[PDB]
Point group: D2
Chain length 121, copies 4
């Protein structure tokens, strides 16, 4: 069971390595249905982004995780297909859980999976 409330991990399918320095923006949908900034960061050398939120701050609701894939590919001299990659999901609606959002990137393709686990507390 992952100890991280909201972990984001990104891989590069072209190089077979972590996707380093990918800008990640997380938003939380409010009562009126609008998106508000929730947390932000960039992937480390491991391709993982640690420190997005504590369980206390990660309240029940719909979340949007945005990966700036365009800037990632353009920095390498590649003109990608997508404007960005977005993962939208409902979280903690049936008790608190720990989430890991994983993404695999290619210039014209991306895949994403989620690993949901229930912590000790």
């Amino acid at each position: 069971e992952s100890k991280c409330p909201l972990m984001v991990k990104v891989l590069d399918a072209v190089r077979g390595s972590p996707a380093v320095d990918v800008a990640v923006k997380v938003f939380k949908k409010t009562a009126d249905g609008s998106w508000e900034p929730f947390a932000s960061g960039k992937t480390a050398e491991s391709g993982e982004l640690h420190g997005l939120t504590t369980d206390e701050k990660f309240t029940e609701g719909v979340y949007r995780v945005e990966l700036d894939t365009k800037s990632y590919w353009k920095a390498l001299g590649i003109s990608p297909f997508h404007e960005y990659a977005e993962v939208v999901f409902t979280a903690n609606d049936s008790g608190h859980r720990h989430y890991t959002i994983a993404a695999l990137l290619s210039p014209y393709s991306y895949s994403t999976t989620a690993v949901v686990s229930n912590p000790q507390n």
Copy 2:
């Protein structure tokens, strides 16, 4: 009519085309807003045709939204994602044919674009 934009969806659990997946296509407007561009449901083939024409499908940023949540729920499955969206710039250099492919699983999905042109 012609089809410069196509959407093809597969179901990874049943090993077949994803039927009745609700799709909504939007196009970015002059001042940054999204305007409804096209809509429909995937057929028995998992493909959605007749979305637009080469004349209507002009240069710009497009957003393709697949209602994966409803699709899985109607199959008695509680999926992870609310939906799956694909955002891209199209026809920035001429007028090509775009095929947005998607592979669905309850907690995962992959999407790929196949861009083509009248090759010889």
Copy 3:
């Protein structure tokens, strides 16, 4: 045109069909050794048709091997995989139509099967 066994290959890097990919299909014998069943190369559409017919495509275990190494090498890329292979038992139950789809990247690939109903 093909009917029982089809192979479709896409390129996730270039956003296009993977053309001229060498495909080899093997089949398990009575004892337990692989045996050449069919071969070909993907066309411009990224598809390989005419591998067999409903008559020769009998029940058993098959192995579809895609020469991905040569595909990437020709583009100047040194991929991870020696090749991509799909092993499955076919027509064990009913004689349906099989489509093996593959999405390729230098260090990654995904394969999916679409088994179509013989009745409807």
Copy 4:
């Protein structure tokens, strides 16, 4: 703790690690024959560590086979594939660290490799 070769498997239907998946690793010989190299089963994390060491994991062509059929069948699911095979050349260009990742669905799977430089 592991270092040279690691295997990680995820379940796309349940959104969790794929536990107890049987893994068998083979290494090619001089005449092109495969010989047993290492084997084990994924733990609760969905990972398999300690398959080999740097001294043991020398240059060569390896074959990593995941028994995906048994995994799905045990859950009552009828999968398409007999297994998922990952064939690759290793340590040819210096002794690196390899991570073979796989995401499983009943009728589909994707595999990715993460190659890193340890004390390079």
